[PDB]
Design a protein around this nucleic acid. Structure first.
Ligand SMILES: [Mg+2]
Ligand SMILES: [Mg+2]
Length: 205
RNA sequence: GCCUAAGACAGCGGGGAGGUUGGCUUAGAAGCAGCCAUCCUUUAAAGAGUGCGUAACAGCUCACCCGUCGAGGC
């Protein structure tokens, strides 16, 4: 299909245009927060997104052109949704750059935790009612005090590792707690002769 | 004969945006009483909106795009 070629053409051509080739994940990012992130990184980095299949060869075809073996090897890391990123910036300040400008998002169900998850206590400030019942339902001591539910507790709710009930999840979406950081997260990257898994980036104090 | 392994049909997940509450009208008309208009931008993709819904908003969803799957579709 004619449009598919023209894409791959622009994909590759944008790939060798810069020294640092980055594979990032935008999955579960909201369109406004995206476009905000977008214009802070505008002049630095360039991005396009396509079917990950078009991108599975993509770079591999251009691994042929520049003649490198292991740049193709990064295509062996592709998951979820994917997009390509190109810049003159090596990863390490680039990673900070992505993780700093991220935003808090509410939590959804059937998901592990990035961090440990807790509550802001006492007055939740609405009318009393049904809302207190499911609060109890998972592990939450709560009473009523002037005008609505108080929560006395400070201790763990869910400790990381073990997952969260289809909703154990939100009293928090209802409480307005958005404990987790989302934005562009990195699948993997590297340029010259060496390749890393994203674990390495959190580290180096 | 056309599309389809460069990922079809269907289903499941995620997105479904900003200008903006388009303009006028109207007690009010925010995509969705009715008239006219029916463009730009940020884009992988998103109509000045396909069907519920509100008192009007909010909310649910659908065209469109991405993933998941993996052989048939007009
Ligand atoms: Mg209406
Ligand atoms: Mg547009």
């Amino acid at each position: 299909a004619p449009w598919k070629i023209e894409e791959v053409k622009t994909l590759k051509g944008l790939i060798k245009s810069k020294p640092v080739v980055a594979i990032v994940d935008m999955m579960d990012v909201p369109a406004p927060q995206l476009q905000e992130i977008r214009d802070k990184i505008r002049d630095k980095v360039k991005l396009r997104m396509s079917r990950n299949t078009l991108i599975i060869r993509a770079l591999k075809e251009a691994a042929e052109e520049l003649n490198n073996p292991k740049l193709a090897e990064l295509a062996n890391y592709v998951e979820r949704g994917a997009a390509i990123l190109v810049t003159d910036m090596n990863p390490f300040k680039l990673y900070k750059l992505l993780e700093e400008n991220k935003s808090p998002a509410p939590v959804r169900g059937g998901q592990i935790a990035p961090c440990d998850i807790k509550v802001e206590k006492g007055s939740t400030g609405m009318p009393p009612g049904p809302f207190l019942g499911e609060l109890k339902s998972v592990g939450i001591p709560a009473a009523i005090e002037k005008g609505k539910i108080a929560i006395k507790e400070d201790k763990v709710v869910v400790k990381k590792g073990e997952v969260v009930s289809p909703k154990l999840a939100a009293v928090l979406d209802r409480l307005g707690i958005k404990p987790i950081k989302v934005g562009l997260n990195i699948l993997a990257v590297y340029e010259d002769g060496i390749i890393y898994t994203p674990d390495v980036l959190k580290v180096d104090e």
